Design a protein around this ligand. Sequence first.
Ligand SMILES: O=P(O)(O)C(O)(Cc1cccnc1)P(=O)(O)O
Ligand SMILES: O=P(O)(O)C(O)(Cc1cccnc1)P(=O)(O)O
Ligand SMILES: C=C(C)CCOP(=O)(O)OP(=O)(O)O
Ligand SMILES: C=C(C)CCOP(=O)(O)OP(=O)(O)O
Ligand SMILES: [Mg+2]
Ligand SMILES: [Mg+2]
Ligand SMILES: [Mg+2]
Ligand SMILES: [Mg+2]
Ligand SMILES: [Mg+2]
Ligand SMILES: [Mg+2]
Lengths: 341, 341
Amino acid sequence: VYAQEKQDFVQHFSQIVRVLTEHPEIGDAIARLKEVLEYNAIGGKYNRGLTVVVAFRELVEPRKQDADSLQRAWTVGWCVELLQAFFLVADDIMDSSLTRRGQICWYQKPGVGLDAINDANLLEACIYRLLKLYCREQPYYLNLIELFLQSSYQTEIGQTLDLLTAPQGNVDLVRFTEKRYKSIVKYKTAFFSFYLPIAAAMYMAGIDGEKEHANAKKILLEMGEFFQIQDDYLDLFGDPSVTGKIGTDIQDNKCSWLVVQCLQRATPEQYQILKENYGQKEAEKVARVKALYEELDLPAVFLQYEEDSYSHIMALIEQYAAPLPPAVFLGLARKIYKRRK
Amino acid sequence: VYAQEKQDFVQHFSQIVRVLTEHPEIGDAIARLKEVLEYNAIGGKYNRGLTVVVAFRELVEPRKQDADSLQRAWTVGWCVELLQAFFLVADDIMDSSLTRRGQICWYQKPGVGLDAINDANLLEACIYRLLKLYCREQPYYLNLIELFLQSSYQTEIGQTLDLLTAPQGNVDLVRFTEKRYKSIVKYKTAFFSFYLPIAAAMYMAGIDGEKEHANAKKILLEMGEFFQIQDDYLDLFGDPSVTGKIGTDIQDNKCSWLVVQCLQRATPEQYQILKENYGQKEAEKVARVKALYEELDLPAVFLQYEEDSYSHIMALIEQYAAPLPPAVFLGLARKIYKRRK
Ligand SMILES: O=P(O)(O)C(O)(Cc1cccnc1)P(=O)(O)O
Ligand SMILES: O=P(O)(O)C(O)(Cc1cccnc1)P(=O)(O)O
Ligand SMILES: C=C(C)CCOP(=O)(O)OP(=O)(O)O
Ligand SMILES: C=C(C)CCOP(=O)(O)OP(=O)(O)O
Ligand SMILES: [Mg+2]
Ligand SMILES: [Mg+2]
Ligand SMILES: [Mg+2]
Ligand SMILES: [Mg+2]
Ligand SMILES: [Mg+2]
Ligand SMILES: [Mg+2]
């Protein structure tokens, strides 16, 4: 259903750009906004934007799916894609990344640099511009504004947790626990990537109940934790030509799922190898950490976690999906299960 | 009236921090938010926050100024101070600044660096948290959310214009015109610093009329243009112990009011001196540009502009203040007239 809707969803980007780039004095700034939008909102899997589109089709009665209603749905999907673009442009600066989605990071582009900070905020500003342009007269207008605002705050608190546990130049092996990992990942990824697209479609379909949103959240935050674990696995063991980005977690002293599991299985001698080689820019030290991971059979430990966690998410769908069609959660789950990009 | 209300307004910051820093898992992130708030929202003149407080007192009938009403007013004032903090933390990174408000820029602090990007977004997130906590049940709640969102977009478009006209490593003397200057300054400063605090107080007082907001805007955008001109003058000719920040406009190849006037009065020989020495990090080249400014009597040209512009703003107050008390605009105008900090 995602694979089918992909070309239809991407075809609507042209309109999104047209409406956002429509006063001659700000001409150069609006021209730069188009360049920012084209570079940073295109090239990913569009899982978040498509989740809004697919979930709205499954939650709204077909006779109530008019052309204006469907336009609002993929506009809101594109708003989640812009939120993604905002966080990625800033995250690549802060993680000193090289590539994103098969091309050099926007801030690494000659002539951009730290101007990417303001470009990132512009991407965030376009969300509320589109919500005003297409959803201002709708009963769920305020619920969507607050949902996009709260999802941004939650991600930013998660990003604070990610950066505080990963100080440059300091050994922070003590703080790389399972409890700390779950808290980072819940806030930095699980809310905006999984709860936000489904919650937006739910509000657009008139499902605004506290209990329904709490039940959907129980499934989606677990799906999010699992998705970040896959992302951490891919940082080191994924193919950069497929993933589109070069890994930096070891160099960046990140509280990765991999380092958390390494610490749980490592011998005192192996702990010292990790202490001496983690969180440093040296290629030989990064190679040493990877060798330790492969030695502790961490790629196979990931295969077993992925199996066990997927069954747990399936048990959560069975418990908390009702009254929503289970396909809403199953579609996204199958889209991310056994991920390689 | 500003001078009197200053200590009262600053005394409320403790509550603002308490309510924003009130889940044990996010403890370290919330602790970092307090550090960000204390470092970056304190030390300025509080002109924007005080404008909300003073204007709300002058627009609302005293019998309608209850304790809850007054708390909402200085909370909204503090929301404008957080918007200021957000833009300043990011602007200092992008302008490669050293000091702000008498202390080293937050990003220049050891252990902060580019993590300041996420800290800046957290400051922006706190605005909407405070609006939800204190104004969610009020009739002007949505008008304030949209006003803070539109004022952020306008500033960001202004910041895009500021950065596009100031490329590092390129001579952009051709684009340093009066028409381009007016457009940068209108968007980057005039909207959020002058229109936003008065417009917020107007909405809180129930004055939501399009015509009234347009009349107030005509005065306040001119006041804003004037305020940025003073800021550009102070960048080079102000005392860093008084202003609290070290100037970077010449080094940063900025389209400053000073360089616009220099180009309008310079001889072809003087134009070449400017071409060869502007927009470069070399101390001897910056000293050369300053010498040219002093040679063209630019400090005296600023004294005359400040006089003529203040009379024009006074003519605009006389024309467009009604039905609002002129003291609303006069208070802010006298607070910024002959500025040195
Ligand atoms: O794409 P990335 O950089 O692997 C990531 O997933 C990006 C990201 C940005 C913001 C929130 N969550 C994840 P990260 O956490 O840095 O591993
Ligand atoms: O404090 P600054 O850096 O002099 C300034 O006024 C800061 C600022 C930030 C954002 C919008 N407007 C002004 P700038 O424009 O860089 O001269
Ligand atoms: C929140 C995370 C883990 C960042 C990357 O998400 P995606 O893997 O969905 O990246 P894109 O498809 O948008 O490129
Ligand atoms: C928008 C501009 C010109 C930035 C500085 O404003 P202020 O001069 O008001 O600085 P603070 O008092 O908040 O420190
Ligand atoms: Mg990151
Ligand atoms: Mg990253
Ligand atoms: Mg990653
Ligand atoms: Mg600037
Ligand atoms: Mg600056
Ligand atoms: Mg300045």
